Design a protein around this ligand. Sequence first.
Ligand SMILES: CCCCCCCCCCOC[C@@H](COCC(F)(F)F)OP(=O)(O)OC
Ligand SMILES: CCCCCCCCCCOC[C@@H](COCC(F)(F)F)OP(=O)(O)OC
Ligand SMILES: [Ca+2]
Ligand SMILES: [Ca+2]
Lengths: 123, 123
Amino acid sequence: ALWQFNGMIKCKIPSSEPLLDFNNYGCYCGLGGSGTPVDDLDRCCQTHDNCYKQAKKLDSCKVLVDNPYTNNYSYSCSNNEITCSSENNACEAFICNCDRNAAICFSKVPYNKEHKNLDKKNC
Amino acid sequence: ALWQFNGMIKCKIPSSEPLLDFNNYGCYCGLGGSGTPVDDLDRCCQTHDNCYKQAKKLDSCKVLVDNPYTNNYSYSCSNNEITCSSENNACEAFICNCDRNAAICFSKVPYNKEHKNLDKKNC
Ligand SMILES: CCCCCCCCCCOC[C@@H](COCC(F)(F)F)OP(=O)(O)OC
Ligand SMILES: CCCCCCCCCCOC[C@@H](COCC(F)(F)F)OP(=O)(O)OC
Ligand SMILES: [Ca+2]
Ligand SMILES: [Ca+2]
């Protein structure tokens, strides 16, 4: 769910409030997403969005009541490393992987303040 | 919470249904507990019970709405190893530790079918 993803980014980037720092960034970070990513961080978000889309196609996900945003899964952060729990069922394990890859990506790319709340008339 | 503890024991003992195998065992495994533990597994349960008691004394726990049984915390199981998440707050981190130590203990001691549903008139 959204809360585990928030916690994953803080595990990788301890100094951030992700929901504040990464939501509404570029053409992909935030609900939805269209166009050409404006930068590398925006590219991370595009991959993550494709990952959730991939996930929804999954038979194990279509059976669940909740979508990738409210689908709680299990993970741990210890020493700034993320571990998706083996207790997660197929769908949850897939989302956890999507979220874990994005958190790592976020922590590896430059952040451009100018792309925050990006004028979606540039997407 | 009770559900994470259940999941922790299965992480260590993949062949079990803990709620079925370990509840109602000896004088300590299960809600409550009094007397002299009947065996090593029962001793594991006594330590775990003392651990929750310790936890409740904790200032950070007394502030919470829920007791150790319904207090959700975060952890992962990967390769049969348990990791308490660093996202857990003081109280949750303490319970997770209590639960993790008990799961490991359970997996290290012999199980005696004869102590199941132990005649609490022997406690
Ligand atoms: C007017 C309403 C528009 C505002 C958007 C609603 C706010 C809810 C947030 C939804 O969250 C969208 C999102 C969150 O970004 C991650 C972070 F936790 F760090 F913010 O998914 P995405 O895959 O797009 O990010 C890569
Ligand atoms: C008539 C009602 C009595 C039945 C008991 C209620 C059932 C709810 C279970 C409560 O659970 C008690 C308990 C669970 O044992 C762990 C396991 F998940 F493996 F079962 O805590 P404890 O510290 O004592 O174990 C060491
Ligand atoms: Ca998006
Ligand atoms: Ca007990």
